[PDB]
């Protein structure tokens, strides 16, 4: 595989990431959309797809010295290190099933389950823009996208 996908923040050689720490509530996989809640705990979003004003908050992969990878789920009830995405960076998202990415530059909406999808940019908040031409069929595949 010439496109190795073992780091969820691949967005330039001079751009550092912005980290939002917090507590866990469930066991999600790295690369999914999050939403902070009451107390100081983070979990999956579970908001509607047609709701604006959400912050671009994805789950960073955990450190190598804590048993973390791009497919290892997080341990519940602990400190999950996340990423707030600035506009103009590339990040590996995680799409849903049965959608093909044909052109580099389509709009990336947010599904209600914590994954992303190609939606019409007239009724949902556009988070990012596609940057890789692949076709996915299993829910949970990593697709490169630019956050602008």
């Amino acid at each position: 595989m010439a496109n190795s996908k073992n780091s969820i923040f691949v967005g330039g050689a001079g751009r550092v990431k912005q980290t939002i720490e917090g507590l866990a509530q469930s066991a999600f996989k790295p690369g999914q959309l999050l939403a902070r809640a009451a107390g100081d705990a983070i979990d999956v979003t579970a908001k509607a797809s047609t709701t604006y004003g959400n912050e671009f908050l994805i789950c960073d992969d955990q450190p190598q010295t804590l048993g973390g990878g791009t497919d290892v789920a997080v341990t519940a009830g602990d400190t999950v290190q996340a990423i707030s995405v600035l506009p103009g960076q590339y990040v590996l998202l995680s799409f849903a099933a049965t959608q093909n990415v044909t052109t580099k530059g389509a709009a990336v909406a947010s599904n209600g389950d914590g994954n992303f999808k190609l939606g019409n940019p007239a009724t949902e908040q556009t988070f990012a823009v596609t940057e890789e031409i692949i076709n996915v069929t299993t829910a949970g595949t990593l697709v490169l996208c630019r956050a602008i």
């Binding site: 496109n3 190795s4 330039g12 590339y90």
Partner: protein
Amino acid sequence: VIESRRYSEAGRINRSMSGQTDIDMDKTKSSYQKMVIPVFDGAYGRDFRD
């Protein structure tokens, strides 16, 4: 048990005509494999009068 570490391969590369576009980073994962050490034994023996 005796364990041993086998790491992986990584690297992303983009081709540029100008030389100024955003380049890509990666890192090396790791995993382990393990063997096992059991014990074998056997004996033999005769009586006293024989």
